[PDB]
């Protein structure tokens, strides 16, 4: 009865947690193979059998390796920031729509907006806590990212929301039963991927890491334990944001198998782009968000305010 | 009393907000930090009263809009502070 | 084709010499790519194409 | 730093991210090549030039 | 909510256990005065990271606070479209988005969106 | 029940907040409290719509002041206060003890949750936030929203004029 | 950008077989000498030099497609590091730095 | 489209899935080639022009080594 | 395991320092390790030094209370701000439990060098015999603690993230050695 | 030099087995540690992360090991920038005096267990500039070295062979099995 109900909710979260945690390990392998094939390389192929156990073969090393205690760092902050980076990455999954109920989440769309914003503090605190010049530049390079994508992100979500009528993610299924919103929203799909990259701090928007501009960005002063969680928390973001693209533009048939064939493909796209584009320039992004994306997104609210109004009169 | 069982806690929190807004901290930002602390508590009470009404919580948005502007304006004045004094310390201002 | 800003002598090649046309037929063509990620599109076709090649790796030491 | 090619030491004067002054500290790869050449026959000195502009 | 809080705590405990395993599973060696020194490309650092870091997007930084608080007023739109008067809802919404665009284009034309130079 | 424990934590975090000196210590204290107040407000309401909004609004303000803290008050100090840790921990457990032995039907707030409403209330069967946010965009209160718009846009003109971007960056000279 | 590094260093690997095949070292051939080169080319090298050259145009086109017209690539390079012609001469500049700014000079 | 027919063949000279797996586990690849010769120490040398130049000639190490 | 055994987190109790008798009945003659190593080698180069006993002690004698105060001044861990304070180890039994627990739990090596065997080393006062040769007989020139310790504890300093201006931390006062006569009175 | 076994003699030798400790442990506790010691070594062996030092003209041949022809990444070797996450350092080039304090520090910042590879003659023994007035005569003067890869520059395969030697050296560590005896 009701007492039993919440037990199942625990199982689902734990089941979803271990499954996501496992997948991000295998995603990292997939990233190396695919990125190893776009480049004419072969990719990890020796370890174990045909390279499949590679990511596990790395999780051993990052945990048998010593913690680093930076001399000039506020140790408690430096030590805790990895936890909340991983926690916020996993926690945002509880809003992922299931028809076999996991959590109701009316206003689920907002819950996305709150959680994704939090992911910046963990980078921000980690960089400042490390107390290294590069780490601080990485942190403040990450914050400036939020100032850019944050506002445009909400508006673009609002456009999708107008189509469905509510902030509950479940309704995306019903409206994408005949077709896919990709057709109606092609430029937004293309724009949305672009902002999605900023969310997860990937090439061409890789500024928090800032590899080859900063030595390793805000991660420059992390090691075995802390660095691992920072890494996993990174790829959990990709996996979710890839899924959130599949529920919005690609049917949202969560109970069908193909939905998971789609989910991996969008994950491939994220790796695919990393092997194509050079990194933007730190300012060109912020100009891009405010000069083009923000103006672009507002323009279609009118287009969808008119379209919904026009459609309302007929129906 | 009703006011003690339901409205005491937010008020006690509010006055603690003010006592932050007046205590002696070197940096002007310490005032801004405590500024939106108080606003957070004002929202809490205002949200108690608005919910005594069945459907009037929409006014929360009205309050939040003025909350950010005073913070946003409060932050602008700090910027103008820097580019005349060079620093925001309270003890750097002429005591008058 | 647009013209060259600087006339070219013999035995020399210029890299950025052609000017930009201002005919609507061309501005729209530039605009369309600038507006639908057209330049990046062919960049993505090329990289994906390399998935379908034999990688040049050697199975050292065998 | 990876972009420095393991030799360069730019002592930048950063006003935020913008650079106001750059001091290219050089000599991290000074191997007194031109003094060794003074001790070597012409043929023995030919390999030294493979190393310059490697 | 109360379900979510419980799982929020349960996850936080789980992730916390992960480093508490890492901190013990980690190889332990004597810490050196140089091992814990900061990383700044192998040369000692001139400047603490806690010096004042100049800012150039300060103006955008403030504008970001504003533009969000208008996101609080567009989000409710959808929820109240079936229930509101269409003229009032239509008129007000438009003159909400035109006001935003006009504000943006005004500053863009004034060059405030550009960074300090 | 957790409402009382939320009362204890918001009190506890407020006591320490009075004693913070380092700006980031203030910020961390404030950020933690913004979570609780956001959580607490949704308990006594028909929906958490406003907690989402409030949380989102303040997080915008949280980032910006770090950017200025990291530029103005970058070099400052912390001091663990054994008086403070004991005092908060002492009262915190003390307060938590009461919440277990409290007549927590009496401590619950009389504000009507969505379930607290009757079954006959026909207006409670619509969308979660339809009616409440409704007259924000209907005659005559809509003009208030319009008034904000100018107020916000006119604000946007105030910051650029106070700021005077062209006369340089900001440094803690 | 990463792929151009690998798409080109694959051709670079083929090219340093010709160094290895005439001199015996993939790098630092020590082949050119004051009296002329130190050995004749191996029999049949020139056929393989042709074979590499015949295919090298395609390799450079693919990198060009991904880089030259890329919108991001232009922004990361355009108007960054301008060298006016009169500045360059005074500086002892040479090579592409000299011809980058329009001077028609090639030793 | 028809690599399976090659794949089944690789198994047959391998000696069934059991010996095929150990081959894959050891050499990290399954390749068809003609035994050119056998050295004094048991290493078997294969060749197949089908593959491109670098991978054209390969060696099987003696079984007793095993890693 | 001497300048770290007193700077470690385990040795403290949240800011404190349980010392036997507050360390005021313990007198020590610590010697810099390099001087000891020099003694070993010098004894190796010489055959005259064979078959004899040598005592390797520093140049000065300090009360254990006096030393630990000086470290925490060097480490910027002064009582005024940091909150350092000295128990008497006999008063608190919690500390002895920590060692007993610490020894048992750790399989490889005690953490913070803390274990009951190490405690007894601290309590016992150095007893340099008269008439046994010292390293000065071997030609070693002993380094004083004031020369070396202030550089040993630089990486253990508290609030090391500060970037202090010059003069914002005042140079600590040196420790006061214990005169030979004073040791008679100190021990009654 | 110990020559390899003849085929007929080798035709009798038993299969080597994976672990270099064999399965001949007397007790359960020893045997479990031995197997558990393999698990560590299998981990560290698999993913060896160089630091991207790249000092001098060995550095170029340290790029071609990552090039598609040889593909260091096939072996789990992944280049990294920060010395904190880096596990191995490949000192490839001429370590001059001006650099020497910088290498020492960068090596120190690397967390244990850290292995060093010396590439080319320059980093091995000073190489072609052995007698120069501003060259450290081999990096082993400054940091411990675990593998020496000769060459000038070492061929790409030569370095690959060096890396595999480091995997085998890692594979046979006795970090746990020696704790038991300790
Ligand atoms: C928990 C204690 C945390 C110790 C720690 O953080 O060390 C770093 C740090 C410095 O330690 P250290 O001075 O280098 O001492 C080295 C030890 O000998 C380091 O220990 P070791 O040299 O003997 O190497 C083995 C290492 C790791 O322990 C093990 O080998 C067994 C763990 C198997 C997994 O031992 C430890 O780190 C101590 C942890 C023992 C906890 C056992 C609890 C068992 C239940 C959990 C499973 O510790 C602290 O400063 C404060 C932490 C105290 C709490
Ligand atoms: C995901 C990860 C798996 C990746 C796929 C590849 C795994 C299979 C493989 O590579 O087989 C090689 C292996 C072929 O090599 P082999 O010539 O026969 O002799 C293996 C070594 O030379 C002779 O072994 P060894 O004893 O001389 O050295 C290995 C050493 C340590 O084993 C390892 O090297 C792995 C890492 C350390 C052990 C991990 C567990 C830690 C502590 C265990 C003690 C408690 O000892 C063992 O543990 C091997 C005993 C087998 C039972 C495992 C215990 O395949 C097999 O013979 C058996 C088939 C694999 C097992 C499949 C079982 C399926 C069960 C469904 C669940
Ligand atoms: C040379 O030029 C070049 C450069 O210039 C320098 C480059 O920078 C680069 C840069 C390359 C990149 C940026 C590539 C992307 C790679 C990175 C950013 C980092 C490298 C690391 C990886 C790819 C590995 C990915 C994985 C991780 C880092 C760890 C993540 C955490 C994981 C996998 C753990 C998951 C958790 C789980 C519970 C999974 C299931 C269980 C386990 C792991 C348990 C394991 C074992 C046990 C518990 C033992 C139990 C035993 C018993 C009971 C007996 C290249 C390619 C280059 O060519
Ligand atoms: C103004 C806007 C600020 C917005 C950022 C707020 C968070 C910044 C906190 C920075 C660390 C503060 C600190 O140093 O306290 C140390 C405190 C201890 O205070 P302390 O006074 O003892 O530290 C000094 C220690 N001595 C005395 C030895 C010098 O340690 C902590 O527990 C802080 C934990 C921080 C956890 C990481 C926060 C990430 C949050 C992510 C988003 C939410 C999920
Ligand atoms: C559970 C135990 C699973 C592993 C059992 C292995 C039994 C096979 C015989 C011993 C062996 O070969 O182990 C090593 C194995 C394969 O050998 P490998 O080191 O990868 O060399 C390259 C091979 N192409 O490589 C492996 O697959 C070992 C993987 C074990 C550790 C996997 C990480 C997760 C923790 C599992 C516990
Ligand atoms: C010690 C204190 C322990 C108390 C817990 C403190 C940690 C808080 C973690 C829970 C935060 C999530 C939450 O509580 O959301 C509540 C509310 C949900 O409302 P609703 O839309 O109806 O969805 C219900 C679906 N079952 O939605 C909201 O109110 C907004 C929640 C935003 C959450 C941001 C993520 C915070 C992560 C923890 C930071 C610490
Ligand atoms: C049909 C609308 C016609 C609008 C004409 C605008 C033509 C040129 C726009 C432009 O960007 O040119 C540069 C001009 C200079 O403005 P500046 O202060 O330098 O700020 C950065 C501008 N990118 O940029 C500007 O001043 C204005 C840029 C935004 C104008 C948008 C107007 C859209 C009206 C619909
Ligand atoms: C994520 C995936 C993580 C995979 C983790 C695999 C862990 C295998 C554990 C082996 C120990 C690794 C840490 C270590 O290196 O400890 C070694 C330590 C011996 O070190 P020591 O003798 O003190 O050396 C002298 C130093 N002066 O050892 C000791 O002192 C005590 C050894 C006792 C045996 C401990 C065995 C622990 C098994 C843990 C399995 C964990 C599974 C979950 C992960
Ligand atoms: S060893 Fe040879 S190839 Fe390597 S850096 Fe020195 S001169 Fe160059």
Short synopsis of the structure:
It is classed as oxidoreductase. Chain A is mainly α and 315 residues long. Chain A has eleven helices and no strands.
How does this model look, in words?
The structure is cut from a larger assembly and holds 10 protein chains of 9 kinds. By secondary structure, chain B is mainly α. Chain B has a single domain, classed as Helix Hairpins, CATH 1.10.287. Chain B has 3 helices and no strands. In chain B, helix 1 runs antiparallel to helix 2 and helix 2 (29-52) packs antiparallel against helix 3. The radius of gyration of chain B is 17 Å and the shape is elongated. The N and C termini of chain B lie far apart (45 Å). With 117 residues, chain E is mainly α. Chain E has a single domain (1-110), classed as NADH:ubiquinone/plastoquinone oxidoreductase, chain 3 (Methane Monooxygenase Hydroxylase, Chain G, domain 1). Chain E contains 3 helices and no strands. The two termini of chain E are 48 Å apart. By secondary structure, chain H is of the alpha+beta class. In chain H, 36% of the residues lie in helices and 19% in strands. Chain H contains 2 helices and 3 strands; from the N terminus they run ααβββ. In chain H, strand 1 and strand 2 (44-47) form a beta hairpin. At the A-E interface, helix 1, helix 3, helix 5, helix 9 and helix 11 of A face helix 1, helix 2 and helix 3 of E. The complex binds cardiolipin (2 copies), Ubiquinone-9, 1,2-diacyl-SN-glycero-3-phosphocholine, 1,2-Distearoyl-sn-glycerophosphoethanolamine (3PE) (4 copies) and iron/sulfur cluster. 1,2-diacyl-SN-glycero-3-phosphocholine sits between chains F (23-25, 27-28, 31, 62, 65-66, 69, 78-80) and A (74, 76-77, 80-81, 84, 118, 121-122, 125).
Would you spell out the secondary-structure blueprint of this structure?
The structure is cut from a larger assembly and holds ten protein chains of nine kinds.
Chain C: H1 24-36, H2 38-49
Chain D: E1 9-15, E2 18-25, H1 33-36, H2 42-51
Chain J: H1 7-10, H2 28-46, H3 58-64, E1 88-92, H4 100-109, E2 115-119, H5 120-125, E3 147-149, H6 156-171, H7 177-181
Parallel strand pairs in J: 1-2, 2-3
Helix pairs in contact in J: 2-6
One 1,2-Distearoyl-sn-glycerophosphoethanolamine sits between chains F (9, 35, 38-39, 42, 48, 51-52, 55) and A (103-107, 114-115, 118).
Features:
part of a larger assembly; 10 chains; I: 188 residues; mainly alpha; two-stranded parallel ribbon; two-stranded antiparallel ribbon; 6% strand; globular; J: 182 residues; Rossmann fold; 3-stranded parallel β-sheet; 3 strands; 37% helix; 7% strand; binds cardiolipin; binds Ubiquinone-9; binds 1,2-diacyl-SN-glycero-3-phosphocholine; binds 1,2-Distearoyl-sn-glycerophosphoethanolamine; ubiquinone (chain F); NADH dehydrogenase (ubiquinone) activity (chain F); NAD (chain F)
Order of helices and strands of chain C: HH
Radius of gyration of chain J: 19 Å
Overall helicity of chain J: 25-40%
Structural class of chain J: mainly alpha
Give the termini separation of chain C. Answer: 55 Å
Strand runs of chain C, count: 0
Distance between the termini of chain J: 34 Å
Structural class of chain C: mainly alpha
Oligomer: part of a larger assembly
- Total beta strand runs of chain J: 3
Q: What's the tally of helices of chain C?
A: 2
- Order of secondary-structure elements of chain J: HHHEHEHEHH
- Main β-sheet of chain J: number of strands, strand sense, barrel status? 3 strands, parallel
CATH topology of chain J: Rossmann fold
Number of domains of chain J: 1
Shape of chain C: flat
User: Hey, roughly how much beta strand do the residues of chain J contain?
Assistant: 5-15%
**DSSP summary: helix tally of chain J:** 7
Can you list the strand order of the major beta sheet of chain J?
1-2-3
Family (chain I): Belongs to the complex I NDUFA9 subunit family.
Protein name (chain I): NADH dehydrogenase [ubiquinone] 1 alpha subcomplex subunit 9, mitochondrial
Subunit structure (chain I): Complex I is composed of 45 different subunits. This a component of the hydrophobic protein fraction. Interacts with BLOC1S1. Interacts with SLC2A4. Interacts with CLOCK. Interacts with RAB5IF.
Organism (chain I): Drosophila melanogaster (Fruit fly)
């Amino acid at each position: 009865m009701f007492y039993m109900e919440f037990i199942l909710s625990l199982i689902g979260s734990l089941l979803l947690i271990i499954c996501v945690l496992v997948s991000v390990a295998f995603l990292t392998l997939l990233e190396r193979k695919v990125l190893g094939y776009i480049q004419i390389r072969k990719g990890p192929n020796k370890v174990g059998l045909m390279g499949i156990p590679q990511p596990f073969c790395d999780a051993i090393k990052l945990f048998t390796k010593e913690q680093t205690y930076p001399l000039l760092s506020n140790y408690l902050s430096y030590y805790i920031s990895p936890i909340f980076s991983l926690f916020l990455s996993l926690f945002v999954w509880m809003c992922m729509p299931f028809f076999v109920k996991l959590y109701s989440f009316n206003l689920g769309g907002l819950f996305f907006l709150c959680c994704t914003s939090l992911g910046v503090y963990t980078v921000m605190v980690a960089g400042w806590s490390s107390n290294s010049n590069y780490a601080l530049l990485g942190g403040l390079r990450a914050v400036a990212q939020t100032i850019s994508y944050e506002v445009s992100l909400a508006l673009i979500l609002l456009s999708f929301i107008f189509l469905i009528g509510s902030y509950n993610m479940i309704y995306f299924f019903f409206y994408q039963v005949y077709m896919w919103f990709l057709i109606i929203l092609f430029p937004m799909a293309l724009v949305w991927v672009s902002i999605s990259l900023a969310e997860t701090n990937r090439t061409p928007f890789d500024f928090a890491e800032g590899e080859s501009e900063l030595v390793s960005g805000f991660n420059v002063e992390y090691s075995s334990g802390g660095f691992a969680l920072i890494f996993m928390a990174e790829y959990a973001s990709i996996l979710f944001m890839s899924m959130l693209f599949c529920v919005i533009f690609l049917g949202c048939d969560v109970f069908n198998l193909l939905f998971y064939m789609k989910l991996t493909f969008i994950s491939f796209v994220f790796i695919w782009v990393r092997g194509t584009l050079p990194r933007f320039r730190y300012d060109k992004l912020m100009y891009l968000a405010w000069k083009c994306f923000l103006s672009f997104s507002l323009n279609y609210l009118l287009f969808f305010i008119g379209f919904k109004i026009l459609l309302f009169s007929l129906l | 009393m009703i006011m003690i069982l339901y409205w005491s806690l937010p008020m006690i929190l509010f006055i603690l907000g003010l006592f932050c807004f007046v205590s002696n901290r070197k940096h002007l930002l310490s005032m801004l930090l405590s500024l939106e602390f108080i606003v957070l508590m004002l929202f809490f009470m205002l949200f108690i009263y608005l919910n005594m009404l069945n459907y009037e919580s929409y006014f929360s948005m009205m309050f939040l809009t003025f909350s950010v502007c005073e913070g946003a304006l409060g932050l602008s004045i700090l910027v103008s502070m820097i580019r005349t004094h060079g620093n925001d310390y309270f003890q750097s201002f002429s005591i008058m | 084709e647009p013209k060259d800003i600087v006339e070219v002598p013999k035995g020399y090649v210029y890299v950025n010499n052609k000017e930009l046309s201002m005919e609507f037929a061309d501005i729209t063509d530039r605009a369309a790519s600038t507006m639908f990620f057209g330049e990046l599109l062919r960049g993505f076709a090329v990289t994906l194409a390399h998935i379908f090649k034999e990688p040049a790796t050697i199975n050292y030491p065998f | 730093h990876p972009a420095a090619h393991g030799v360069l030491r730019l002592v930048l004067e950063l006003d935020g991210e913008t650079v106001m002054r750059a001091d290219p500290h050089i000599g991290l790869l000074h191997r007194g090549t031109e003094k060794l050449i003074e001790y070597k026959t012409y043929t023995q000195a030919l390999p030294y030039f493979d190393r310059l502009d490697y | 909510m109360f379900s979510i809080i419980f799982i929020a705590l349960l996850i936080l405990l789980i992730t916390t256990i992960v480093m508490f395993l890492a901190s013990i599973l980690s190889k332990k060696a004597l810490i050196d005065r140089e091992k814990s020194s900061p990383f700044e490309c192998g040369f000692d650092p001139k400047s603490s990271s806690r010096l004042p870091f100049s800012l150039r997007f300060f103006l955008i930084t403030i504008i970001f606070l504003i533009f969000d608080v208008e996101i609080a007023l567009i989000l409710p739109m959808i929820i109240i479209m079936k229930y509101s008067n269409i003229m009032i809802w239509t008129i007000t919404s438009i003159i909400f988005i035109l006001i935003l665009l006009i504000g943006l284009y005004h500053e863009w034309n004034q060059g405030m969106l550009n960074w300090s130079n | 029940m957790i409402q009382l424990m939320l009362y204890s934590l918001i009190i506890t975090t407020s006591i320490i907040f009075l004693n913070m000196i380092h700006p980031l210590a203030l910020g961390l204290t404030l950020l933690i409290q913004t979570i609780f107040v956001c959580l607490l407000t949704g308990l006594m309401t028909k929906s958490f719509w406003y907690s989402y909004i409030l949380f989102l609004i303040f997080l915008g303000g949280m980032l910006v002041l770090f950017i200025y803290v990291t530029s103005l008050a970058s070099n400052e100090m912390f001091n663990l206060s054994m008086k403070l840790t004991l005092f908060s921990s002492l009262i915190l457990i003390f307060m938590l003890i009461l919440s277990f032995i409290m007549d927590k039907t009496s401590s619950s707030l009389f504000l009507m949750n969505n379930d607290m409403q009757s079954i006959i209330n026909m207006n409670s069967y619509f969308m979660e936030n339809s009616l409440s946010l409704n007259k924000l965009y209907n005659f005559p209160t809509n003009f208030i929203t319009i008034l904000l718009m100018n107020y916000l846009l006119i604000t946007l003109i105030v910051i650029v004029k106070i700021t005077k971007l062209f006369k340089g960056p900001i440094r803690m000279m | 950008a990463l792929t151009p590094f690998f798409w080109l260093f694959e051709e670079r690997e083929k090219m340093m077989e010709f160094y290895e095949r005439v001199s015996g070292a993939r790098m630092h051939a020590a082949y050119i000498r004051p009296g002329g080169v130190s050995l004749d080319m191996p029999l049949g090298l020139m056929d393989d030099i042709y074979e590499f050259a015949s295919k090298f145009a395609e390799r450079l086109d693919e990198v060009e497609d991904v880089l030259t017209t890329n919108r991001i690539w232009v922004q990361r390079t355009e108007d960054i590091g301008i060298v006016t012609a009169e500045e360059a001469l005074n500086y002892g500049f040479s090579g592409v730095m000299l011809r980058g700014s329009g001077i028609k000079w090639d030793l | 489209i028809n690599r399976l027919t090659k794949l089944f063949q690789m198994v047959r000279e391998a000696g069934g899935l059991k010996q095929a797996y150990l081959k894959l586990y050891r050499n990290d690849d399954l390749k068809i080639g003609t035994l050119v010769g056998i050295d004094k120490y048991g290493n078997k040398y294969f060749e197949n022009p089908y593959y491109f130049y670098g991978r054209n000639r390969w060696i099987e190490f003696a079984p007793h080594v095993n890693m | 395991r001497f300048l770290r055994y007193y700077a470690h987190i385990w040795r403290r109790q949240f800011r404190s320092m349980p010392l036997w008798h507050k360390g005021e009945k313990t007198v020590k003659q610590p010697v810099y390790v390099s001087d000891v190593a020099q003694a070993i080698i010098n004894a190796a180069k010489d055959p005259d030094s064979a078959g004899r006993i040598y005592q390797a002690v520093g140049p000065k004698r300090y009360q254990l209370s006096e030393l630990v105060d000086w470290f925490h001044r060097l480490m910027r861990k002064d009582q005024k701000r940091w909150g350092y304070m000295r128990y008497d180890m006999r008063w608190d039994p919690t500390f002895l439990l920590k060692a007993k627990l610490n020894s048992f739990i750790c399989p490889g090596t005690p953490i913070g060098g803390l274990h009951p065997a190490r405690i007894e080393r601290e309590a016992v006062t150095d007893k340099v015999l008269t008439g046994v040769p010292t390293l000065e007989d071997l030609g070693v020139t002993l380094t004083t603690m004031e020369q070396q310790v202030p550089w040993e504890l630089r990486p253990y300093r508290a609030a090391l993230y500060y970037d202090a201006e010059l003069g914002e931390f005042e140079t600590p006062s040196p420790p006061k050695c214990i005169e030979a006569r004073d040791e008679l009175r100190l021990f009654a | 030099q110990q020559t390899l076994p003849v085929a007929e003699v080798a035709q009798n030798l038993p299969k080597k087995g994976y672990s270099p400790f064999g399965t001949k442990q007397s007790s359960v506790a020893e045997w479990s540690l031995a197997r558990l010691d393999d698990l560590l070594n299998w981990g560290r062996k698999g993913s060896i992360w160089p630091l991207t030092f790249g000092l001098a003209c060995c550095a170029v041949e340290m790029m071609h090991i990552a090039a598609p022809r040889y593909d260091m990444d096939r072996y789990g070797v992944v280049f990294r920038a920060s010395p904190r996450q880096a596990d191995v350092i490949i000192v490839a080039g001429t370590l001059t005096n001006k650099m020497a304090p910088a290498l020492r520090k960068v090596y120190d910042q690397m967390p244990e267990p850290r292995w060093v590879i010396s590439m080319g003659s320059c980093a091995n023994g000073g190489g072609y500039y052995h007698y120069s007035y501003s060259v450290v005569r081999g990096c082993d003067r400054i940091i411990p070295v675990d593998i020496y890869v000769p060459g000038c520059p070492p061929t790409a395969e030569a370095l690959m062979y060096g890396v595999l030697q480091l995997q085998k050296k890692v594979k046979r560590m006795k970090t746990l099995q020696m704790w038991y005896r300790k």
